[PDB]
Design a protein around this ligand. Structure first.
Ligand code: 0UT
Ligand code: 0UT
Ligand code: 0UT
Ligand code: 0UT
Ligand code: MG
Ligand code: MG
Ligand code: MG
Ligand code: MG
Ligand code: MG
Lengths: 351, 357, 351, 357, 191
């Protein structure tokens, strides 16, 4: 009945509300169907260096998916098989996930139903934390105050300054400004070796933080386990898992007490739902990484849903239909994901 | 926004096309609870439960009728309903009859949700319909009847059959399996089911003899809850051990897979927790590298296996055929999903009246 | 020689001495024998939703057991085999256990001997704790004072309030009122995920509690192990094990340093005695859950007996032959379990 | 309320119907300590101990006589007495001779308790009497005598026999086992017992040859306390390894089962800790999925196996037949519990006088 | 059957139904040429059959000899011998290790007795073909008696005075052969 009829991609470098210590390289995806609906998703390329490559890959993948049914699960299986030799990971897997997210958006539109309801769940608000960067004491404290004013009950800051004392000064200044009934997540963004991570993390633990994220190299699951083994505070990781199979290797060894898959890297909706099944059985509270628009839907269907990360990479090109009430993400009452392009703005940012 | 507006159940004892022969004697009927889940969209979801023994039948019907109070007026959102039932039954024990009743609700809710969207369940789950190889399931039949049933199954187009073994002597098991082989030829599957009847060392001895014979798998060689025991049996075999029909929820499956209890899995759509449980089970089987087959509930399992990354076989054991229209068909031994919304279950209303308890 | 001749069940909703934050759904069981004695037991249905189902199941099981010898061990084997396909767990296993407890009561009567002596043990008093609920600071403190006055040396309170600070306020107020030479057990009743359980439990540990019970989902033995691994205070669990086989899976992985089987869920007397053998070898102090009347006998025969839970669900329909002296349960000098129906009261509560 | 009021012991060296042939020579008698536990109910509990070698006989009798002081005037409550003896001997070591003496008390106390209630022990333990398959136990007999004994056992109705092997050459072991097979035919069990005589690699080599032969199990291939060694031998075999006759208390059994030392178990009613220890052992064997047989003490083991969920075989090796009435009978090779209170042991008082030490 | 694997499948299936201590005779009913008979028979022999009967054309005694020469299992034949003189020709060249005359074709009682004397001298165990009523008598007088064929062609029209106990035919205590017509039944079937 419903077939894919075309794929269009647009590579953009878009401005960010708050610069990271100023633009995000994105691939915006339109998936045309025989039912007249168009699915939308986007990818984050992390670095402009990967941006044209990711767009080129998707365009070259158009011939593989055009005329195939709009069945994301069957499409995912087909792509997994076709890329089994090239390696169904990294940019290839990201591109497949962009297709998956646009296909589920389209399937939601075909049925005139928000994605969360198509998944069999009710919409519910999800607590969100406001994600900042390696901002220094002044700006980190400022941004936390602003977030608290807006109703967010937690913030994340990036740490990993040259000295542990600088990490601690940032956390202490945030804590003074927001008080004790407030979440402070800290992200080391893979910056430390295992011994340095144990030392810094035990000091931060005494400080009072909500979680310690990616203390060491992301692929080092055993290293994360050794760090977690020396901590009472939970270690958080998962944004870098490419597919539920990478997540499964990390969970199988007990690398961390929390998980936060990235909707793109984990494999889109199809991968997210598989990830959610694993986190449930392993008893891991599961949060999101980026992709706040689709992650609101996904978390509502996730048995161990924990936090949504608010980090609005695509706001300059996507209508703000996702809203926050008392720090909670509220899924819009729109079919599929609720992504609507800001078409006038896209033209400004094309690479 | 679509709400559940009613739950009706009917207990029936229905005739089986293949009477099930056991060590005790022959059972000619199956105890089922037929479920109708009414909605504010007007469509009605259909599912059913198998109660296994008439002893459990009225109790299971009573439990579902009492559980109606928990779900009527809730939104038709199976994942959310499941979470609520799991929490409400956390003290009583979200397992056994309670879990089976919750699964009957879940299966009817997904059938209703398919109907709300006028789409076959497989498509709602995001997959394409595909034919799925099916084996014909027989019983503890002895040589004469096993041969007769195997010839019939081959003539119908099936490419495998399953027989129940666990006779008093290993030579009896071997005799039945060898006889089936003569009837079906070499390029044909013979699954064997010990139905939990052996201790570990007897299972290792019998299974090694069966393995030399050429069987497709050895199913539930010992007590179902003894996952460590299945692991010890599997460790001595090249043929795969099959189990899973008795897992109550994905959490039981998870425990068995975590210790490597078997190289194959076959969840029961009811006991595993309905569609919602099956999808979670499918994600575990994929990660653990376990080919996944079905147990009973052929109507819904044809949909579910089409969405299962490691789909293996569909079990054809047609418990509800007297009371459900044969919209599921078989071509070349492969189950063919009907082009109907939801699961494609249409009651045979005139027939149901014959069998009510 | 002695045969079962009949089974009668009565479903009741009975009032509770202290309401849980007010009635208990019970199935009262009479097992008639050819020796003229009648065994008594009862089941707890947890929720009225399961009550009629459990009674119906038992009535339908009557034909399986009538004319069988009064041999609880052989009867248990028969029921295990007959329910091997349906699943010998949940309500079915509970119903089998109700039969088992009434059969051992009858066997005690046949021999005119209290159950504890039939089991080969001497009666001894067993320390009991008074079990309360999620009562708030005022009522929890009140109930603990009342329990201390009555001679109990420990109480259990249910915690898991929205904030950890509320858990702590309850425990601190109880502690002030009862002093330092007194047991305060805390029960989370499966309310927390593993990270939240580690955090709350380490805070409660610093407070001074006797044990932390069911911090997370009961079937999650691995999660309980991970929680226990971060604690000095013992984790307690077991009330939800259906059969000694579930207990064995939890003990085999070291899920908790304490165990408390429920006489019904564990499989009656037959299951309890098996459970007791496992707790002995694994070195686990073993307490009871509910069923105080039979648990007094059972604990006297348990090598690692720890505490009896006083939580009098059936008092409104059972004569108070079990007494407490200095907080210790005293087994009555009566044949079998010492259960005598309050027949006038039963009529008031029939469903 | 019923109190122990006396303990009498008698050391005897009794004639064996089957002299036991060993590598050294033939032993024609067994050293036993016969136990009478008097009570305030008037009934007297009977049990006995096997001392294994006459070297231990007087020491074991002396130990029991001295232990009398701990139990006379205590209530006849075997579980409570056991706890007290375990605590009192915690420093000396609650194992070996001390543990065996405590077990003799326990077995006599349960026999007395059966008598107090005028009920067979099996019924007191909550089970029905059922016949239990028995194998006839022979010794290191060589070809001529093993064949002769095997023919006699088959004529008596036994369906299995056990022979002792561990000759200097593997071909000798094989020769004896093959000869027995000719005498009994193919549908008959042959258990083999190495009686701790091999090192691990020799046991693996010999056992793989025996396995090809068709034996029922391979018993105690290496030193009894080397559980890891039994595990390593079992890991190389399809045939099950059997052990357990030398476990002193359930705690020793527990250590062996925890590492997977063997697929079968056979506690000795004395060494395992009497009835009280046997019941605990039975609960462990059930959970670990181990079929459980007996070692010696056929009179009490017929009761105990009837209460054992994984009951497997009863060992017929009639050490005390000269001094105990043959109230235990065999029909079709199955031990039949006599309808007598307690264990059904009645002393042959005229015979005992012949054999006193 | 058209394929050897089909023959083997049927024989193996029978074996599962009856167990190991039970005879399975196989009859090719003259259907094979000599080399096919040698190939099929060697496969059947590995299977465990009791005998291989009439593997090729009945009058080809030399052909039966050549087939028998390649087998350990015995070749059976003789149902088609017309008179002892035909039996004599086959035995003289060693056509088969077993014989089974048909009471009719061999020449009745008179022919059977002569056939029995030949089978004795040639050392051939001798069974019957059809005519179970008279063959029970005749085999009792046959020094090398082997098996009686139970194939009850005339049961609808002859009283069942021949009985079977433990699979053994029991001669009735009646004069002559013990054949008593079922006169009411015969009328149903007349041509
Ligand atoms: O967790 C994140 O959001 C992230 O790891 C990330 C990584 C990559 C891209 C966007 C966010 C992070 C955010 C801010 C500063 C450092 C790291
Ligand atoms: O696998 C099955 O279908 C089953 O285990 C079963 C169990 C319970 C109900 C229906 C089918 C089985 C099949 C054939 C013979 C015995 C058992
Ligand atoms: O441990 C208990 O007694 C129990 O877990 C329980 C559970 C279910 C029924 C009765 C008692 C508990 C008691 C009071 C409050 C919460 C939990
Ligand atoms: O298993 C036995 O009975 C025993 O180990 C034994 C050991 C010690 C005393 C009695 C029996 C055995 C039997 C036959 C040959 C050698 C050993
Ligand atoms: Mg991060
Ligand atoms: Mg099965
Ligand atoms: Mg509790
Ligand atoms: Mg031995
Ligand atoms: Mg012929």
């Amino acid at each position: 009945e419903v077939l894919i009829t075309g794929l269009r991609t647009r590579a953009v470098n878009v401005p960010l509300a708050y610069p990271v210590h100023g633009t995000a390289p994105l691939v915006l995806i339109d998936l045309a169907t025989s039912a007249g609906v168009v699915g939308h998703s986007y990818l984050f390329a992390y670095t402009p260096v990967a941006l044209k490559s990711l767009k080129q890959l998707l365009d070259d993948m158009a011939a593989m998916i055009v005329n195939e049914p709009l069945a994301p699960v069957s499409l995912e299986a087909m792509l997994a098989k076709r890329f089994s030799l090239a390696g169904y990971t990294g940019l290839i897997r990201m591109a497949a996930a962009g297709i998956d997210m646009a296909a589920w958006d389209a399937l939601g539109k075909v049925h005139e139903t928000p994605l969360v309801k198509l998944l069999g769940a009710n919409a519910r608000p999800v607590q969100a934390y406001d994600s900042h960067s390696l901002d220094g004491v002044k700006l980190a404290t400022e941004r936390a105050v602003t977030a608290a004013e807006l109703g967010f009950r937690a913030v994340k800051t990036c740490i990993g300054y040259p000295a542990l004392d600088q990490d601690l000064a940032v956390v202490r200044s945030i804590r003074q400004a927001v008080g004790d009934d407030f979440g402070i997540m800290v992200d080391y963004n893979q910056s430390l070796d295992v011994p340095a991570a144990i030392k810094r993390s035990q000091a931060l633990q005494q400080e009072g933080v909500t979680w310690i994220e990616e203390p060491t190299l992301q692929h080092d699951y055993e290293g994360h386990q050794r760090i977690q083994s020396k901590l009472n505070v939970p270690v958080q990781m998962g944004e870098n898992w490419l597919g539920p199979e990478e997540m499964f290797k990390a969970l199988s060894i007990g690398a961390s007490r929390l998980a936060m898959p990235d909707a793109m890297k984990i494999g889109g909706v199809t991968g997210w739902i598989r990830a959610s099944a694993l986190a449930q059985q392993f008893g891991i509270p599961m949060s999101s990484h980026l992709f706040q628009e689709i992650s609101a839907h996904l978390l509502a269907a996730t048995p161990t849903a924990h936090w949504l990360e608010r980090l609005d990479l695509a706001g300059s090109v996507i209508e703000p239909t996702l809203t926050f009430e008392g720090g909670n993400a509220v899924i819009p009452d729109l079919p599929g994901v609720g992504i609507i392009w800001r078409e006038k703005e896209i033209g400004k940012y094309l690479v």
